[PDB]
Amino acid sequence: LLQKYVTWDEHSIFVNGERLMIFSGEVHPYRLPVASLYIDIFEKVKALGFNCVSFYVDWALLEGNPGHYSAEGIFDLQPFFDAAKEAGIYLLARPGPYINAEVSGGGFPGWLQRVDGILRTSDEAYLKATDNYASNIAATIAKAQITNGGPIILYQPENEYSGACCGYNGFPDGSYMQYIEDHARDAGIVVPFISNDAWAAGHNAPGTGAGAVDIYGHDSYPLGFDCANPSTWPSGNLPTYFHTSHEQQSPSTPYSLVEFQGGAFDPWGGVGFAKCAALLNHEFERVFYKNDFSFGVAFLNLYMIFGGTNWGNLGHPGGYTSYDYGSAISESRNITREKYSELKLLGNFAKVSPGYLVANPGDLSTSTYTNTADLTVTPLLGSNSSASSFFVIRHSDYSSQASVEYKLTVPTSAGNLTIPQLGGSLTLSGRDSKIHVTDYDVAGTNILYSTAEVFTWKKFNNEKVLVLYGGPGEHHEFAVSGASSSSVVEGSSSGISSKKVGKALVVAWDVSTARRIVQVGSLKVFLLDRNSAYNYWVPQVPTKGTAPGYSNQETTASSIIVKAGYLVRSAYLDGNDLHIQADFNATTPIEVVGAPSGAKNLVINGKKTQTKVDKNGIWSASVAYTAPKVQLPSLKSLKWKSVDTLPEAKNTYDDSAWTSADHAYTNNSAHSLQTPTSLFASDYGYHTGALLFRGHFTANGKEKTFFVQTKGGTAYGHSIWINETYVGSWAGTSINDNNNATYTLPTLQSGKNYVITVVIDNMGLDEDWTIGSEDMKNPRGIIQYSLSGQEASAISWKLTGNLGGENYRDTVRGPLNEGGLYAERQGFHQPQPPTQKWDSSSPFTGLTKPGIRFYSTSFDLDLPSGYDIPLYFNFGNSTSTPAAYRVQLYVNGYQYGKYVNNIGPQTSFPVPEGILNYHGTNWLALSLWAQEDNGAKLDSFELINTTPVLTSLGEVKSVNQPKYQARKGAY
Ligand SMILES: *[C@@H]1O[C@H](CO)[C@@H](O[C@@H]2O[C@H](CO)[C@@H](O[C@@H]3O[C@H](CO[C@H]4O[C@H](CO[C@H]5O[C@H](CO)[C@@H](O)[C@H](O)[C@@H]5O[C@H]5O[C@H](CO)[C@@H](O)[C@H](O)[C@@H]5O)[C@@H](O)[C@H](O[C@H]5O[C@H](CO)[C@@H](O)[C@H](O)[C@@H]5O[C@H]5O[C@H](CO)[C@@H](O)[C@H](O)[C@@H]5O)[C@@H]4O)[C@@H](O)[C@H](O[C@@H]4O[C@H](CO)[C@@H](O)[C@H](O)[C@@H]4O)[C@@H]3O)[C@H](O)[C@H]2NC(C)=O)[C@H](O)[C@H]1NC(C)=O
Ligand SMILES: *[C@@H]1O[C@H](CO)[C@@H](O[C@@H]2O[C@H](CO)[C@@H](O[C@@H]3O[C@H](CO[C@H]4O[C@H](CO[C@H]5O[C@H](CO)[C@@H](O)[C@H](O)[C@@H]5O)[C@@H](O)[C@H](O[C@H]5O[C@H](CO)[C@@H](O)[C@H](O)[C@@H]5O)[C@@H]4O)[C@@H](O)[C@H](O[C@H]4O[C@H](CO)[C@@H](O)[C@H](O)[C@@H]4O)[C@@H]3O)[C@H](O)[C@H]2NC(C)=O)[C@H](O)[C@H]1NC(C)=O
Ligand SMILES: *[C@@H]1O[C@H](CO)[C@@H](O[C@@H]2O[C@H](CO)[C@@H](O[C@@H]3O[C@H](CO[C@H]4O[C@H](CO)[C@@H](O)[C@H](O[C@H]5O[C@H](CO)[C@@H](O)[C@H](O)[C@@H]5O)[C@@H]4O)[C@@H](O)[C@H](O)[C@@H]3O)[C@H](O)[C@H]2NC(C)=O)[C@H](O)[C@H]1NC(C)=O
Ligand SMILES: *[C@@H]1O[C@H](CO)[C@@H](O[C@@H]2O[C@H](CO)[C@@H](O[C@@H]3O[C@H](CO)[C@@H](O)[C@H](O)[C@@H]3O)[C@H](O)[C@H]2NC(C)=O)[C@H](O)[C@H]1NC(C)=O
Ligand SMILES: *[C@@H]1O[C@H](CO)[C@@H](O[C@@H]2O[C@H](CO)[C@@H](O)[C@H](O)[C@H]2NC(C)=O)[C@H](O)[C@H]1NC(C)=O
Ligand SMILES: *[C@@H]1O[C@H](CO)[C@@H](O)[C@H](O)[C@H]1NC(C)=O
Ligand SMILES: *[C@@H]1O[C@H](CO)[C@@H](O)[C@H](O)[C@H]1NC(C)=O
Ligand code: NA
Ligand code: NA
Ligand code: NA
């Protein structure tokens, strides 16, 4: 419409006038605040065979101060866009304004709690509040569009605009979506708009009038977000209606799953992301992702492919620090999980199978395509008798762990065939799914059919190579049209049969851990078992430069096949040297199939490597791996300095500079006040981290109890003191976001002044998933209070959150990073704090009573260069009954962890190189808040590493780490 770079028809999207099956992975730039590491994520995504990445932009981080959009330094998106382009990955931009994403406010900055309008509606105040952010982010995205030589090809307006409740009846509001769309277009956005309906409801589909997007898309998370039972696949959870609904809701556009389950989030007191990785494992992928292909999906994005970390309080209360998500690429960026390797097999199948996009999805059947009803097959039939067809097979009961033998009865250019034709039966093992192919094209050679799955294929000059694989214990068969005979050119000929049947040469074989290569004419067919296929890679090879280029027919055709190990990032030909960039985590045998004619030498990670060439023209070599020594500090043995970070609990404390909580009104349109003045922190500009309230009053001697209702979000906690006397604490739980408590008080002297100090942990602002719920407006602070024997107005309040509130002090680390604790307000969490007069006490000694202390220490690192080494800070928790205490982890000023001993479940906190300095000094800081009478201390706290990966990744540049500087107006 507005451009010709990205177009579409009923079958697929076209990029540069060429059909492209778009297989994407979700990555959030703000969850990995290290520019140097973006290229790593993109290369790992490209290595899966993917060609696109989908990303959100978090408004709360870019306009923390209303009226001032700021996306510089670690918040700069340019390095993210540049890495995508460098890696040859396109982008789907999803700026919101509302993104949900399990982030604080669902993306909404805390000041939205002061906006007099229902969020995500046409209410004037809400729309106006989004204008500054929307115009700025759209302009930034506009410059990176493919129409301007950038990687961005699609744009998503809003996010899961799919439902309302609670009094708001304007949904769906055509003019609302049209407003977002018009504003983006006015900002320069010309690429197509794609939606992401929460479910297949057809909202904003083409033809629905105002607000309609260009390509209708929807989401799906079939296994849910509770990973407690990783091996349980509930009955009926596998969707079977996506194609039907698509033809009814948006038949004119390519079927698109903008968000398809790639893992799951986990709540405070949850089960841990390891279980989520186990639930959404390699079996889940092959069964559910191939099920998506059975619907003819042309755009598939997996949420998440890499989750990252909710550092600096950017996450919502419904989750904790980690956002590992159990995705293919872990929080520490590793790709050891089997799900990564399995996904690579499907990604590479899609990349070399144009026939799949033009095939017509049909209805599933338990009788038409096999000899047993225990199996279900969904056909994707070619346009004519000679066109390629695909058959997605699975157990009829998708959760079945049974092994079933069968025979495939499918239509082909040679008529209806019953396979195997040479005898025996095929096997579908537990929780597996396969895509059988017929009349599949391999550079002009017709593969009449293949039961074993296609990993990849290439034409190297006059030689053709096809890579097939089957799972353990399977018998397979394939046929090549017009072929006369075959020869086993590698491996034993045992179990391999070859016979000319009709106008095709049929070859039968049994899966083995040993590779067999069968030569059929000019075609070399590699016969592999799944686990061997896991080690193959298909890097693109550009003629000029080192960048692979985007994925298209041409770059796909000039790619090569490399058998290696942990990872193969890229390859390029420089003169007569074939360069391969890869990572290794063990001794790795190397094989290169299809080295360019001009290539004479093999260079791996810049090192000339000894290679030999075999009868099949395969280059072979080996890369040695020797685990290097990784010297890490013993945290317990470091020199620690500490300071009381609750000076408010002393009679000498002066809070005159604090904000007076004196508004006899609230700007929160969803919650009326129950106190004389507003005690909702957002009404005063405090939206993140620890919040403190101090209520001053003159006693009348009749006081006995102090009732109070606090609210800090799920898993929050609070602690109270009256002058220097401890009153009590609400240690919190995984199911409470607020708490009502009546505390008794010591006797007070009439005529004397007292102050009640209430410290409240803020776990972030809630999302607003259902429009009209206004859940994002759930306040943080004091909701109710009553001092017995006194009028509520007898107490005058002061409050504080992060120093300066919306006029936040750390422009480099963002509006959410630091909370309101004394040490944070002073900036003591930054490198080189003023510890000269501090005490020499460590967190291992801790506190012997309720309170909050801040700790500091430093240590130097000089880790092995040339290695990608994940570092984690681990807290011990071997005790049966957990002590009640909260910890905030600060590394070089960046908060990278909120630890709640009594709630969990996180004990291991990864921190990326870039935040940590691997060849310099590091400043570690911790706040320790004891919420029990016995006090609190750390029993075990260590810095550990996991497998050092021999890498080709460039040196990681340390991000800006502003050192401590005395702050004006601090208190
Ligand atoms: C360096 O990086 C690499 C990555 O690049 C890291 O390697 C990855 O490590 C992962 C662990 O962290 C690992 O995942 C676990 O795998 C467990 C093993 O099961 C799988 O493998 C079986 C075959 O073993 C061979 O391959 C694996 C690796 O794939 C290897 O570890 C073995 O040593 C062995 O290798 C040798 O053979 C291959 C060729 O075959 C050669 O290439 C090698 O050189 C060696 O010679 C395989 O049978 C199994 O599949 C069966 O079981 C799964 C379910 O577990 C089914 O889905 C599947 O259908 C199949 O079941 C059928 O067949 C069997 C056998 O006939 C039959 O009995 C059944 O009835 C059915 O018919 C797997 O692919 C796995 O147990 C484990 O799972 C965990 O535990 C339980 C399992 O009970 C599970 O429910 C949990 O969810 C949990 O995940 C993991 O999946 C990756 O596979 C591995 N990837 C690669 C590429 O190697 C490496 O660790 C890292 N190094 C360091 C130091 O960090
Ligand atoms: C370090 O290791 C330790 C273990 O050594 C580990 O501690 C465990 O952590 C888990 C996860 O956080 C704890 O399990 C959860 O506990 C939740 C809290 O339970 C208590 O509080 C509940 C809420 O009470 C308040 O609110 C309600 C409602 O507003 C109100 O009525 C109350 O008055 C109060 O204000 C309360 O409901 C609950 O009561 C049950 O248990 C008591 C005690 O037996 C019993 O007397 C009651 O009759 C009732 O049965 C209890 O007082 C809990 O809410 C939560 O349950 C939800 O989630 C689970 C899934 O996990 C669901 O199955 C369930 O249906 C709920 O939705 C869950 O049980 C666990 O208690 C800790 N273990 C111990 C021994 O302390 C740390 O997390 C680890 N730390 C790290 C860093 O990893
Ligand atoms: C701590 O104690 C408080 C109460 O002191 C608990 O909160 C109350 O919980 C009960 C039980 O769930 C709720 O009762 C329901 O009330 C429904 C009617 O709600 C309206 O009328 C209420 C009475 O005045 C009013 O409080 C409530 O306010 C809410 O909506 C307003 C409009 O959006 C908004 O301005 C307010 O801020 C607030 O969100 C409504 O106007 C009734 O239909 C149900 O049958 C049931 O009786 C109370 O409504 C809750 N009170 C409030 C103010 O929310 C709280 O759960 C306790 N905490 C814990 C952990 O137990
Ligand atoms: C790759 O990154 C992931 C995610 O950061 C790392 O996974 C974590 O690995 C540890 C160590 O294996 C797991 O903890 C262990 O759990 C078992 C089972 O309870 C327990 O017996 C051990 O004592 C230990 O606690 C942890 O659960 C897991 N976390 C997640 C989120 O999956 C993995 O270690 C990294 N791999 C490499 C090589 O870097
Ligand atoms: C409770 O704490 C308050 C501080 O908020 C004390 O009042 C202050 O006391 C200091 C020291 O005498 C004076 O310099 C301040 O001017 C006082 N401020 C106020 C608001 O009165 C108060 O004395 C303490 N109460 C008791 C009995 O210890
Ligand atoms: C061949 O198979 C198709 C589909 O399985 C079936 O409809 C047809 O009757 C069979 N015979 C013909 C006409 O080729
Ligand atoms: C907050 O409320 C006050 C008093 O009603 C009003 O003057 C002010 O404009 C409001 N702020 C916003 C953001 O609406
Ligand atoms: Na080629
Ligand atoms: Na424990
Ligand atoms: Na735990």
Q: What is the 3-state secondary structure (H, E, C) of 760-787?
A: ECCCCCCCCCCECCCHHHCCCEEEEEEE
Take residue 858 and report the two structure tokens written for it: 């430093």
- Name residue, tokens 């979506």: 177
Take residue 142 and report the two structure tokens written for it: 């506009």
Q: Is 155 left (phi over 0), alpha (psi -120 to 50) or beta?
A: beta
C-alpha 349/C-alpha 433 separation (Å) is 14
| Catalytic residue check, 259 | yes
786 lines ligand 3 (CB under 6 A): no
Take residue 792 and report the two structure tokens written for it: 């509520």
331 lines ligand 4 (CB under 6 A): yes
Read out DSSP for 426-487?
EEE-TT--EEEEEEEEETTEEEEEESSEEEEEEEETTEEEEEEEE-TT-EEEEEEET----E
Q: Which residues approach ligand 6 with their CB closer than 6 A?
A: 368, 411, 416
DSSP classification of residue 847: B
Ligand 4 mutation target, pool 946, 950, 951, most atoms within 8 A of CB: 946
Contacts of 920 (CB under 8 A, 6+ apart): 860, 861, 958
Strand pairing partners for 610? Answer: none
Q: State in Å, rounded, how far the first CA of the chain is from the last one.
A: 57
**Nearest protein Cα to ligand 5, atom 24:** 754
Resolution (A): 1.9
Q: How far is the CA of 572 from the centre of ligand 9 (A)?
A: 51
**Which member of 259, 283, 285, 774 is catalytic?**
259
C-alpha 601/C-alpha 592 separation (Å) is 11
Is the preceding peptide bond at 304 cis, omega within 30 degrees of 0?
Answer: yes
DSSP classification of residue 154: E
**Nearest protein Cα to ligand 3, atom 28:** 671
- Name residue, tokens 């985590």: 585
Containing H/E element for 604? strand 601-604
C-alpha 277/C-alpha 330 separation (Å) is 9
Take residue 640 and report the two structure tokens written for it: 């620690």
**Nearest protein Cα to ligand 6, atom 9:** 416
Q: How far is the CA of 55 from the centre of ligand 9 (A)?
A: 37
**Nearest protein Cα to ligand 7, atom 6:** 667
Take residue 474 and report the two structure tokens written for it: 């399977």
567-574, strands of its sheet edge to edge? 567-574, 577-583, 601-604, 607-609
CA 789 to chain centre: 53
C-alpha 747/C-alpha 725 separation (Å) is 11
Ligand nearest to the CA of 737: 3
Q: Are 406 and 419 in contact (CB under 8 A)?
A: no
CA 765 to chain centre: 20
Take residue 588 and report the two structure tokens written for it: 């790795």
Containing H/E element for 272? none
Strand pairing partners for 219? Answer: 259
Contacts of 247 (CB under 8 A, 6+ apart): none
**Which member of 26, 63, 158, 160 is catalytic?**
160
DSSP classification of residue 5: S
261 lines ligand 1 (CB under 6 A): no
Q: Are 53 and 42 in contact (CB under 8 A)?
A: yes
Helix/strand/coil for 824: helix
Q: How far is the CA of 734 from the centre of ligand 3 (A)?
A: 21
C-alpha 889/C-alpha 897 separation (Å) is 5
In this structure, is the dihedral angle defined by the CA atoms of residues 477, 481, 482 and 487, taken in order, positive or negative?
Answer: negative
- Name residue, tokens 């960048």: 547
**Nearest protein Cα to ligand 4, atom 38:** 947
Name the maximum alpha-carbon separation found in the chain: 108
Q: Which residues surround ligand 10, an ion (CB under 5 A)?
A: 904-905, 907
Q: How far is the CA of 450 from the centre of ligand 6 (A)?
A: 19
Ligand 6 mutation target, pool 384, 416, 436, 438, most atoms within 8 A of CB: 416
Q: How far is the CA of 876 from the centre of ligand 9 (A)?
A: 8
Walk me through the domains of the chain, giving residue ranges and CATH numbers. Answer: 1-355 (3.20.20.80), 356-536 (2.102.20.10), 537-625 (2.60.390.10), 626-645+822-971 (2.60.120.260), 646-821 (2.60.120.260)
Distances (CA, A) of 259 to 27, 55, 94, 191: 12, 11, 12, 19
**Nearest protein Cα to ligand 3, atom 29:** 671
**Nearest protein Cα to ligand 1, atom 57:** 283
* Residue 450, φ and ψ in degrees, nearest 5: -155, 125
Q: Are 67 and 685 in contact (CB under 8 A)?
A: no
Helix/strand/coil for 702: coil
Ligand nearest to the CA of 750: 5
709 lines ligand 3 (CB under 6 A): yes
946 lines ligand 1 (CB under 6 A): no
Distances (CA, A) of 313 to 102, 255, 611: 12, 37, 51
C-alpha 510/C-alpha 130 separation (Å) is 61
C-alpha 688/C-alpha 572 separation (Å) is 47
Is the preceding peptide bond at 864 cis, omega within 30 degrees of 0?
Answer: no
Helix/strand/coil for 142: helix
6-8, strands of its sheet edge to edge? 6-8, 13-15, 18-20
C-alpha 674/C-alpha 693 separation (Å) is 16
Q: How far is the CA of 27 from the centre of ligand 10 (A)?
A: 26
Q: Which residues approach ligand 2 with their CB closer than 6 A?
A: 269, 733-736, 877, 880-882, 901-907
CA 543 to chain centre: 33
Using alpha carbons, select from 336, 320, 196 the residue that is nearest to residue 265: 320
Burial class (CB in 10 A: 0-12, 13-18, 19+), 865: exposed
Using alpha carbons, select from 217, 485, 442, 428 the residue that is nearest to residue 349: 442
Number of the ligand 2 atom closest to the C-alpha atom of 877: 1
| Catalytic residue check, 331 | no
CA atoms within 13 A on the CB side of 740: 2
Using alpha carbons, select from 347, 200, 202 the residue that is nearest to residue 262: 347
Number of the ligand 2 atom closest to the C-alpha atom of 735: 54
Q: Are 349 and 302 in contact (CB under 8 A)?
A: no
116 lines ligand 7 (CB under 6 A): yes
Q: Which residues approach ligand 5 with their CB closer than 6 A?
A: 651, 696, 723, 752-755
Contacts of 81 (CB under 8 A, 6+ apart): 91, 144, 150, 151, 152
In this structure, is the dihedral angle defined by the CA atoms of residues 577, 578, 579 and 584, taken in order, positive or negative?
Answer: negative
Ligand nearest to the CA of 902: 2
Contacts of 589 (CB under 8 A, 6+ apart): 563, 564, 620, 621, 622
* Residue 415, φ and ψ in degrees, nearest 5: 100, -175
Q: How far is the CA of 306 from the centre of ligand 10 (A)?
A: 22
733 lines ligand 3 (CB under 6 A): no
Q: How far is the CA of 322 from the centre of ligand 2 (A)?
A: 21
C-alpha 383/C-alpha 10 separation (Å) is 14
Take residue 9 and report the two structure tokens written for it: 């028809």
Ligand nearest to the CA of 112: 7
Using alpha carbons, select from 679, 776, 779, 806 the residue that is nearest to residue 117: 776
**Nearest protein Cα to ligand 4, atom 9:** 274
Spell 368-402 as b/e; 16+ CB within 10 A means b. Answer: ebbeeebbbbbbbbbeeeebbbbbbbbbeebbbee
Using alpha carbons, select from 75, 45, 41 the residue that is nearest to residue 57: 75
Q: Give the chain's count of helices (H) and strands (E).
A: 13, 55
Spell 714-726 as b/e; 16+ CB within 10 A means b. Answer: bbbbbbbbbbeee
Name the experiment that determined this structure: X-ray
Ligand 3 mutation target, pool 671, 736, 786, most atoms within 8 A of CB: 671
753-760, strands of its sheet edge to edge? 659-660, 796-800, 691-698, 753-760, 718-722, 725-730
Number of the ligand 6 atom closest to the C-alpha atom of 416: 1
671 lines ligand 3 (CB under 6 A): yes
Which amino acid appears at position 105 of this protein?
G
534 lines ligand 1 (CB under 6 A): yes
Is the preceding peptide bond at 910 cis, omega within 30 degrees of 0?
Answer: no
Q: Are 22 and 300 in contact (CB under 8 A)?
A: yes
User: What Rg, from alpha-carbon coordinates, does the chain have?
Assistant: 30
